[PDB]
Amino acid sequence: GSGSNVIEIGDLTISPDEEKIIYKGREVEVKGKPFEVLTHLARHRDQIVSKEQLLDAIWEEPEMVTPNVIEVAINQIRQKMDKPLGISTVETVRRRGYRFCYPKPACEE
Numbered sequence: 001g002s003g004s005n006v007i008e009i010g011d012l013t014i015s016p017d018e019e020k021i022i023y024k025g026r027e028v029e030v031k032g033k034p035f036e037v038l039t040h041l042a043r044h045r046d047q048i049v050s051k052e053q054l055l056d057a058i059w060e061e062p063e064m065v066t067p068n069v070i071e072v073a074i075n076q077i078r079q080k081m082d083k084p085l086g087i088s089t090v091e092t093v094r095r096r097g098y099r100f101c102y103p104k105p106a107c108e109e
Contacts, residue, residue: 007043011104014039023085023102032080034073036060038090041100051097074098 005017013022016039021028037058041049044057051070061069074090082089087106091099 007039009042009046009100010102012042012102014042016040021081021085023087024104026085028081028084030077030080032076034077035080037069037073038077038081038100042089042102045100047101048093048096048099053096054098070098 004015006013006015008014011023014020016036019029019031019035019039021030037054037060040058041054045054049057051067054070055065055067059065071092074092078089081087087103089100089102091101093099
């Protein structure tokens with residue numbers, strides 16, 4: 001019996017309590033601001049989400065959050081994760097907005 005938080009998305013395991021990320025056996029600790037919106041959406045959205053949907057989904061920041069907070073969280077996080085992990089987390093689509101889907105096999109066309 002252990003008392004901690006542990007969430008997994010597809011093939012990735014990340015913990016909010018310890019704000020740590022585990023991918024392919026690789027552990028990476030992220031202490032960013034957007035890390036919350038991304039993480040939460042990674043275990044709550046784990047799929048295609050809309051810019052507005054996500055904004056209202058977390059809406060952690062005050063009225064000064066602005067709708068741009070989404071793009072800022074994705075860019076910052078991507079560079080603080082997708083960069084060091086050379087992987088893809090959130091895919092910006094002109095359809096809905098942003099889709100959170102952590103791959104694994106990394107098999108492209």
